[PDB]
Design an enzyme around this catalytic site. Structure first.
Site, PDB file in Angstrom:
ATOM      1  N   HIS A 192       0.872  -1.218   0.000  1.00  0.00           N
ATOM      2  CA  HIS A 192       0.000   0.000   0.000  1.00  0.00           C
ATOM      3  C   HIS A 192       0.901   1.258   0.000  1.00  0.00           C
ATOM      4  CE1 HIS A 192       0.664   0.123   4.474  1.00  0.00           C
ATOM      5  NE2 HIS A 192       0.663   1.425   4.208  1.00  0.00           N
TER       6      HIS A 192
ATOM      7  N   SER B 183       4.349   3.042   8.211  1.00  0.00           N
ATOM      8  CA  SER B 183       3.902   2.004   7.254  1.00  0.00           C
ATOM      9  C   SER B 183       4.991   1.469   6.380  1.00  0.00           C
ATOM     10  CB  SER B 183       2.823   2.617   6.320  1.00  0.00           C
ATOM     11  OG  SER B 183       1.677   2.745   7.122  1.00  0.00           O
TER      12      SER B 183
ATOM     13  N   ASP C 173      -0.371  -7.588   1.979  1.00  0.00           N
ATOM     14  CA  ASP C 173       0.178  -6.213   1.873  1.00  0.00           C
ATOM     15  C   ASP C 173       1.723  -6.299   1.903  1.00  0.00           C
ATOM     16  OD1 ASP C 173       0.452  -3.500   1.852  1.00  0.00           O
ATOM     17  OD2 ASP C 173      -0.188  -3.145   3.883  1.00  0.00           O
TER      18      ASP C 173
END
Ligand code: NA
Ligand code: NI
Lengths: 251, 27, 62
Positions: free
Chosen positions: A43, A198, A99
């Site tokens: 992502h 992230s 992911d």
């Protein structure tokens, strides 16, 4: 990183900062897994709802960093990318399942006191270390709170949470390709990853051979450090076969 | 070969300030 | 990816009812003061993603 502390110099020498070329800004964390491969969250590279679809020419990786904002001449190494590989079953539409992405550097990097790869777990490591209550460590230059930013790399240790507690914590559908971490509301300790962390590594130290293993990738969360809520991480070991086949085919 | 061993820590037999919190959780 | 509080009616991919993401195929109707938010079926628009940095040598930029 919420409720963490400044990293010691060299404590996470596999930490990578994903960096946009134009405008020049931090995009995500990542990790160094060999002299030519960096691991991150899909992502961070591909996320259609935000019209995000970065190509290799859009991005740099910065390795060996401590300061969030300084250009750390002769310490950090800034690398261009040859190619980006996103997991073919990455599910951005529902829950960020699978992911995971890999990025191949244009040229292999020399390691240094500040730059060195982390290990990826094998069957035996995952079984031993991935249990509720065992703590891992997350690092990053993300937000210090949900609603601000650090001058230097931050670090926080967080315990793995049992799978039923993770599931009860959210109405999002959790898969076996995710795990969650964080302290319970009763536990008198707090902490979490947050925006900008992230893609960065969740690592654990083997008591058997003193090596650090990357067990997870910072993936997603509902808020940052909220009571009753937990961070979700990509389960690296579960996806290790894809990692291996990308490196074997394209390395 | 030596993945996961940090030049400034494990390679010099030095521990970081919070590593022992992690190992203590494995008992 | 951190989902954060919806900031206007019609957004999705944001926290709508308490700490719960209002997902694709839905949209958040924001409550006024003393009203609760609601996540309803609809055509939402994703909440926009939320320095400082020293300029790096031009050689890295092409
Ligand atoms: Na929490
Ligand atoms: Ni080495």
């Amino acid at each position: 990183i919420v409720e963490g502390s400044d990293a010691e110099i060299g404590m996470s020498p596999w930490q990578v900062m994903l960096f946009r070329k134009s405008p020049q800004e931090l995009l995500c964390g990542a990790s160094l897994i060999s002299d030519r491969w960096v691991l991150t969250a899909a992502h961070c590279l591909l996320y259609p709802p935000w019209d995000k679809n970065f190509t290799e020419n859009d991005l740099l990786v910065r390795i060996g960093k401590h300061s969030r904002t300084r250009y750390e001449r002769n310490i950090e190494k800034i690398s261009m990318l040859e190619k980006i590989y996103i997991h073919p079953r990455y599910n951005w539409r529902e829950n960020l399942d699978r992911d995971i992405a890999l990025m191949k550097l244009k040229k292999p990097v020399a390691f240094s006191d500040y730059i060195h790869p982390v290990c990826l777990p094998d069957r035996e490591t995952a079984a031993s270390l991935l249990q509720a209550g065992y703590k891992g460590r997350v690092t990053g230059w993300g937000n210090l709170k949900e609603t601000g930013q650090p001058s230097v790399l931050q670090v926080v240790n967080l315990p793995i949470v049992e799978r039923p507690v993770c599931k009860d914590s959210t109405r999002i559908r959790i898969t076996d390709n995710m795990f969650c971490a964080g302290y319970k509301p009763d536990e008198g300790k707090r902490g979490d990853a947050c925006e900008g962390d992230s893609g960065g590594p969740f690592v654990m130290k083997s008591p058997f051979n003193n090596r650090w293993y990357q067990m997870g990738i910072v993936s997603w969360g509902e808020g940052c450090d909220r009571d009753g809520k937990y961070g979700f991480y990509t389960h690296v070991f579960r996806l290790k076969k894809w990692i291996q086949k990308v490196i074997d085919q394209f390395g | 070969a030596d993945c996961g061993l940090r030049p400034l820590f494990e390679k010099k037999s030095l521990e970081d300030k919070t590593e022992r919190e992690l190992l203590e959780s494995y008992i | 990816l951190t989902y954060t509080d919806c900031t206007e009616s019609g957004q999705n991919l944001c926290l709508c009812e308490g700490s719960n993401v209002c997902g694709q195929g839905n949209k958040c109707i924001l409550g006024s003061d003393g009203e609760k938010n609601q996540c309803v079926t609809g055509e939402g628009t994703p909440k926009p993603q939320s320095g400082d940095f020293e300029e790096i040598p031009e050689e890295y930029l092409q």
